[PDB]
Each structure stands twice: as structure tokens, then as C-alpha cells.
Amino acid sequence: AGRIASFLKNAWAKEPVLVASFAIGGLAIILPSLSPYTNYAIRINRATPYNYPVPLRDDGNMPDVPSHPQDPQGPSLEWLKNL
Amino acid sequence: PFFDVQKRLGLDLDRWMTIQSAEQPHKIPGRCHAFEKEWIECAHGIGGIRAEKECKIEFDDFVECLLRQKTMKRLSAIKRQRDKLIKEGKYTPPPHHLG
């Protein structure tokens, strides 16, 4: 409390570089956890086709996979478009 | 492992890279992925001493893919017997050989 606040104040008085380092390192470890865009970062990361979308043998009973590339079925990155 | 804590705890530390047919970043093949798939899938549940005997043909091909000893040795016979034919004029190269 009082001593802790005074401890920080004298830390900033004579040792301002380290308290800057610890503060930045202290933050840089915890916002990535509760970040709201971290899942977005993963989502756009998997949404980068390095490897070819190999086709699948059409045996029916699968409506989710589009028959045509332009077909509405299948995943879309409309979210990636506006963000 | 001498103490296979790997299997007991059910958590992976080393077997991910142990073979080149395992999971790879962005699904790129390890050159001889096709051959070593045949050999490993020949050797599972067979035992070390047995598998070296029956799965010898698969291992020989996989080594030839990996090591590539005899294939370029044969290619050596291609080139050595080639220049030992052109030097005396017995062979002439067709024009697709050059351009």
C-alpha cells in the first residue's frame, strides 16, 4: 500500500528504464490472453491458401461442400473482407 | 524410451519429428514419404527381428529413395559409357540433347 506506492515512486526516481521495461513486459504478457482479435488473427491465418484445395470425390450426401467454386455452399471469408 | 513416460502420460514430446511421414507444416511431403509409409505400415505390430526380414523389400526401396545409391550408379554407367562412345565418334547426340 503506502510502502508499495513509495517503492514504485523511488523506483521511478532512480531506476526509470527498468520500470519501463517491466511495465511493457508486464503488459505484453497479458493483453494477448484477453485480446479480442487473437481469434481473428488465427482465423485469417488459416484463411490463407498456401496449399491447393484438393477436390473430393463426389459421392453425394454432402451439401456443405460446393459443387462449383463460385457456389454459395462452403466457407466464406466475408468477415475478412470488412475487417 | 527406456522409461516410456511418453506413452503413459499420453502427451507428445519427441515422436512428432521422429519420422518424415508424420504431420508436416502446411502438408508438404518429405521426398520419400510414399516409400517410408509402406515400410512403416509394413513393420507395425511385427517386431524388430521379424520386420527386418519380411519387410526387407520395402526397406530396400525406401533406402534407394532416401540414399539413392544404385540409381545414380546406373546413371554413372549412362554417362561413362556415353563419353566412351562419343570420344571415338561411335555416337552422335540428337538435336534435342542441346536445344
Binding site: - | 512428432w16 519429428m17 518424415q20 508424420a22 507444416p25 518429405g30 521426398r31 540414399l67
Partner: protein, 98 residues
């Protein structure tokens, strides 16, 4: 098998002979021990890059970062025998005769 690998393989052997034979100085021996892991590094990278063993690219970086730890230990020991004996000559390092 390509002659570049045999070039590397002797490179270990000539490095191995230099490390074992010794002449005067532990600096040279530490140098010889580094050619050991060096020639190991090119040999490791050469096989791994040739076979497109993607995960195996791990080992080259892992190899020398731990081989360099030998230097962290080997170099330190030399200066101590240099501080006490003077020159770090292997001939000086004979107190443990018994």
C-alpha cells in the same frame, strides 16, 4: 553417394585427428572440437535439406546452440588453467598424476 558428403566425412576425421593428437595448446583443441560440430552442422543440413525432412530442420539450429554450450564451458576452463598455471599448455595440466 555424392563426393560432397565424403568431403564432409573426412572433415570430421581430420578434425577428429587434430582434437585427439594435440600439439601444445588447449585453444587449438577447443578449435578442433568446434570443427567437429561445424562439419556436423553442414552434414546435418545437407541431408535434411536434400530429403525435405521439414521438421528435421529443427536439429541444425538445436545442434550448434548446444555445441556452443561446450564453448561456454570449454573456454571458461581454459582461462582458469591459464590463471593458475600460466600458459594453458596441456603439458602443464599434469597435477593429477596420481
Amino acid at each position: 553417394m555424392p563426393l560432397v558428403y565424403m568431403n564432409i566425412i573426412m572433415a570430421f576425421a581430420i578434425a577428429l585427428a587434430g582434437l585427439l593428437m594435440y600439439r601444445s595448446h588447449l585453444m587449438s583443441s577447443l578449435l578442433c572440437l568446434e570443427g567437429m560440430m561445424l562439419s556436423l552442422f553442414i552434414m546435418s543440413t545437407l541431408i535434411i535439406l536434400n530429403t525435405h525432412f521439414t521438421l528435421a530442420n529443427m536439429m541444425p539450429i538445436i545442434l550448434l546452440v548446444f555445441a556452443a554450450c561446450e564453448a561456454a564451458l570449454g573456454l571458461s576452463l581454459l582461462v582458469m588453467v591459464s590463471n593458475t598455471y600460466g600458459t594453458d599448455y596441456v603439458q602443464n595440466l599434469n597435477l593429477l598424476q596420481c
